[PDB]
Amino acid sequence: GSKPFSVPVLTVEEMTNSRFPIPLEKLFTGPSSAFVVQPQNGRCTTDGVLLGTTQLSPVNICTFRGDVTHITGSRNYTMNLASQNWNDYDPTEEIPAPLGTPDFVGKIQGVLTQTTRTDGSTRGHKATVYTGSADFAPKLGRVQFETDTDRDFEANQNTKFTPVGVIQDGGTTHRNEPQQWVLPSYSGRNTHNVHLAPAVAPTFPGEQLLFFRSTMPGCSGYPNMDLDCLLPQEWVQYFYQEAAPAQSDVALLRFVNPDTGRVLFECKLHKSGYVTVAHTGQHDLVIPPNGYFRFDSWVNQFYTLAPM
Amino acid sequence: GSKPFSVPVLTVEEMTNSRFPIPLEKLFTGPSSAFVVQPQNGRCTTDGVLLGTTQLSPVNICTFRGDVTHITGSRNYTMNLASQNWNDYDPTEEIPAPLGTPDFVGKIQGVLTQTTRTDGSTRGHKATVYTGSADFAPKLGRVQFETDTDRDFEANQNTKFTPVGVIQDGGTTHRNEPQQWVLPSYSGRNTHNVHLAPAVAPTFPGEQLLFFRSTMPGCSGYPNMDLDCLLPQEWVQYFYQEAAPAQSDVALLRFVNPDTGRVLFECKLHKSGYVTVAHTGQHDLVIPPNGYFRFDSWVNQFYTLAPM
Ligand SMILES: C[C@@H]1O[C@@H](O[C@H]2[C@H](O[C@H]3[C@H](O)[C@@H](O)[C@@H](O)O[C@@H]3CO)O[C@H](CO)[C@H](O)[C@@H]2O)[C@@H](O)[C@H](O)[C@@H]1O
Numbered sequence: 029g030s031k032p033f034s035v036p037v038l039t040v041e042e043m044t045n046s047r048f049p050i051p052l053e054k055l056f057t058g059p060s061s062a063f064v065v066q067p068q069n070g071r072c073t074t075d076g077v078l079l080g081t082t083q084l085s086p087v088n089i090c091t092f093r094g095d096v097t098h099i100t101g102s103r104n105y106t107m108n109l110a111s112q113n114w115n116d117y118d119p120t121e122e123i124p125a126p127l128g129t130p131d132f133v134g135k136i137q138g139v140l141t142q143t144t145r146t147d148g149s150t151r152g153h154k155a156t157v158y159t160g161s162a163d164f165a166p167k168l169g170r171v172q173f174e175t176d177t178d179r180d181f182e183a184n185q186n187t188k189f190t191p192v193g194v195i196q197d198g199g200t201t202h203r204n205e206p207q208q209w210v211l212p213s214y215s216g217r218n219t220h221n222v223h224l225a226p227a228v229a230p231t232f233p234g235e236q237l238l239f240f241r242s243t244m245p246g247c248s249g250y251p252n253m254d255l256d257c258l259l260p261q262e263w264v265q266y267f268y269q270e271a272a273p274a275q276s277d278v279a280l281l282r283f284v285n286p287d288t289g290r291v292l293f294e295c296k297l298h299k300s301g302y303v304t305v306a307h308t309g310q311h312d313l314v315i316p317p318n319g320y321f322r323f324d325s326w327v328n329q330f331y332t333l334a335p336m
Numbered sequence: 337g338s339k340p341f342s343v344p345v346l347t348v349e350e351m352t353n354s355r356f357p358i359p360l361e362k363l364f365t366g367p368s369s370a371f372v373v374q375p376q377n378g379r380c381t382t383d384g385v386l387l388g389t390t391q392l393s394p395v396n397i398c399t400f401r402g403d404v405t406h407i408t409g410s411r412n413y414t415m416n417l418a419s420q421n422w423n424d425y426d427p428t429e430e431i432p433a434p435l436g437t438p439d440f441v442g443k444i445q446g447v448l449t450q451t452t453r454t455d456g457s458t459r460g461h462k463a464t465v466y467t468g469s470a471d472f473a474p475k476l477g478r479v480q481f482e483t484d485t486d487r488d489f490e491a492n493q494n495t496k497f498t499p500v501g502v503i504q505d506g507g508t509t510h511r512n513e514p515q516q517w518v519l520p521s522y523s524g525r526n527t528h529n530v531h532l533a534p535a536v537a538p539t540f541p542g543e544q545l546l547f548f549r550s551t552m553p554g555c556s557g558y559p560n561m562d563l564d565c566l567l568p569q570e571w572v573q574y575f576y577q578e579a580a581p582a583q584s585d586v587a588l589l590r591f592v593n594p595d596t597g598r599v600l601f602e603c604k605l606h607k608s609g610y611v612t613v614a615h616t617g618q619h620d621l622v623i624p625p626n627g628y629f630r631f632d633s634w635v636n637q638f639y640t641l642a643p644m
């Protein structure tokens with residue numbers, strides 16, 4: 029009679045994407061046989077074990093901290109990464125990359141901020157990191173930023189990157205980037221990623237993944253702003269805190285409409301931390317804004333869900 | 337025998353400021369008789385009732401969404417606010433301002449992003465909101481942004497402000513701004529704020545508030561980057577979810593050091609949602625990074641704490 033598992037009573041709009049620091053907006057299901065679904069943020073087992081590059085607070089996702097070195101003759105800077113608490117970076121943890129590192133290939137725009145310790149002077153500049161760059165190597169402790177300055181960043185001073193959104197440019201077709209299911213090479217071009225959370229896929233006939241979807245802000249061009257995570261950040265936080273043991277491989281959840289008292293759909297929360305539904309095709313779910321998920325029963329992986 | 341109250345097992349560095357979307361860094365106590373401590377974000381009772389402008393996800397704090405109108409002849413734009421889910425803004429809720437509105441006077445810099453619905457084209461520009469401006473009126477649905485453009489924002493299209501940090505300029509003395517304990521006038525200059533969470537203060541002799549402190553990124557000048565919240569965002573989230581009834585006015589917490597098994601200090605978590613310690617003077621707490629808070633007992637308001 030183990031500690032009862034549960035999911036939080038939070039509506040979709042009350043929750044947060046686990047792959048970029050923005051609120052959730054909607055639920056989406058579609059086929060995924062054409063890509064490999066292996067995000068590294070928003071990965072957590074139902075009994076509370078964090079996976080991949082997943083950490084607990086949503087505001088740290090896609091942030092970087094460290095020291096910057098100017099690439100003379102350009103407006104580009106190399107960041108030598110620190111830990112999130114500004115201590116030295118320890119690359120020996122058995123993780124793919126620092127926790128919270130971006131887990132998709134794209135051009136992420138935001139702001140580099142810096143403080144000079146001696147006098148508390150500060151400065152902030154637009155900056156973009158291309159996580160598909162050959163020199164994107166956060167696991168090695170190095171990432172490059174393109175900025176709007178060649179002079180107003182000091183070396184050897186604490187510097188932070190705050191993400192804002194994504195861009196599309198450099199001749200790509202509209203909405204051809206970011207590529208949210210393409211993992212970076214965390215140690216640089218032509219290196220192999222390590223310690224990854226596994227890829228996920230529906231295995232039961234008639235099932236698709238259920239995605240928790242947000243729209244990333246766009247900062248220039250015609251980017252693909254869709255961003256799907258496998259678990260809301262709040263579910264990561266909740267499972268980590270509760271650490272309730274899984275009694276089977278699959279937790280059956282019902283999505284409840286409090287305005288009618290009726291179930292809108294049911295789904296499988298797999299103990300390794302992803303959700304499936306019985307549907308074939310691309311579908312934007314139409315949900316009551318006060319709807320929420322409710323854990324009802326531990327079932328087997330071969331339970332047949334009610335179609336939705 | 338009511339549902340047991342508890343606080344989450346999270347270290348300070350695992351948690352998030354509830355007044356700006358940045359991680360917590362440290363604990364600080366100091367005297368507060370010289371100012372009025374009345375923040376509106378990070379306000380929640382121990383039995384889960386949100387107060388002030390407090391909402392649940394840390395990434396929405398100090399964000400704005402809506403439509404923008406260019407002030408011809410300037411680089412300034414008026415934002416007509418929407419709800420966070422992009423629905424019409426409803427000013428009739430009995431709250432001081434939209435949930436997540438900044439609750440301090442200062443110059444907050446970040447980025448305005450916009451998407452044109454017809455073709456998915458996007459744009460992003462540096463922007464600053466002065467929450468002490470006479471025309472800062474989020475409760476009325478209007479705030480002004482200074483930007484780096486007079487042409488590249490369209491009217492009548494969804495626009496978001498993502499906060500990054502704070503600036504100091506315009507002739508202020510170093511670290512004289514932001515003023516984290518000065519509430520904005522949420523309906524504009526010379527209007528009275530409504531529906532506020534109350535001011536808080538130590539009342540017991542020898543006690544001070546305990547603050548959960550972060551350093552806001554600085555983007556220009558010599559800003560005062562200290563930002564103290566009364567509750568970590570995760571405690572707001574946890575109390576909201578657990579809604580455990582308070583059995584007295586004060587929850588006695590012990591801060592435990594897992595590396596020694598010993599208590600470092602104890603404190604009072606008042607049921608209305610703030611913490612006090614027995615200390616006189618300004619003190620940066622030196623804590624084990626894996627330390628955490630643990631609820632031990634409901635006590636009375638006149639319990640004498642062990643000095644720290
Ligand atoms: C889509 C626009 O993005 C920003 O301008 C960028 C600019 O976009 C141009 C497109 O490349 C092009 O197809 C054409 O139709 O006009 C667009 C500008 O109106 O592309 C350049 C690089 O070529 C830069 O990346 C610009 O930032 C934005 O500022 C515009 O308002 C549009 O949203």
Ligand SMILES: C[C@@H]1O[C@@H](O[C@H]2[C@H](O[C@H]3[C@H](O)[C@@H](O)[C@@H](O)O[C@@H]3CO)O[C@H](CO)[C@H](O)[C@@H]2O)[C@@H](O)[C@H](O)[C@@H]1O
Pocket residue numbers: 149150151152180504505506555556557558
């Ligand atoms: C402190 C600097 O902030 C940014 O530059 C700002 C500039 O700061 C100047 C101070 O005002 C002044 O006391 C003097 O000592 O030099 C500073 C520049 O080195 O002030 C202007 C307005 O007067 C703008 O706000 C600038 O952004 C930053 O870019 C600098 O690197 C310094 O951190």
